[PDB]
Design a protein around this ligand. Structure first.
Ligand code: 31P
Length: 108
């Protein structure tokens, strides 16, 4: 699909070395305990990350571009939900989200 093809194109860019300085926290699912937090899944009922998005895209589980956008945004939303507005990871999330939001808008 031309939209989903566009989305796959966005996913690839989000995973580029190009944005690796602020994207790396979003490459894989949050491992709370490992990071020293034990309340993350109390707060966050629906974890999401880029590898899972890439998985679903490979299984063609996305009915359209909107479902894709919803997951990517959920990933960012989870990060802003759990963390304080001044946290570094949050700043990393806004930088990557600006790449996503800008490419998503340029879709046919
Ligand atoms: C687990 C909650 C939060 C935290 O306090 O981590 C110690 C965490 N911080 C971080 C975090 C904290 C500070 C910086 Cl500068 C970057 C990432 C984090 C780190 C990772 O390493 C593989 C993966 C995920 C996160 N992450 C995401 C995404 N959303 N919130 C976080």
């Amino acid at each position: 699909s031309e939209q989903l093809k566009h989305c796959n194109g966005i996913l690839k860019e989000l995973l580029s070395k190009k944005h690796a300085a602020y994207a790396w926290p979003f490459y894989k699912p949050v491992d709370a305990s490992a990071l020293g937090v034990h309340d993350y899944h109390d707060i966050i009922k629906h974890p999401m990350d880029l590898s899972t998005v890439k998985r679903k895209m490979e299984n063609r589980d996305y009915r359209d571009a909107q479902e894709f956008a919803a997951d990517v945004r959920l990933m960012f939303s989870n990060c802003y939900k759990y963390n304080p507005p001044d946290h570094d990871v949050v700043a990393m999330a806004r930088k990557l989200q600006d790449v996503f939001e800008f490419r998503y808008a340029k879709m046919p």
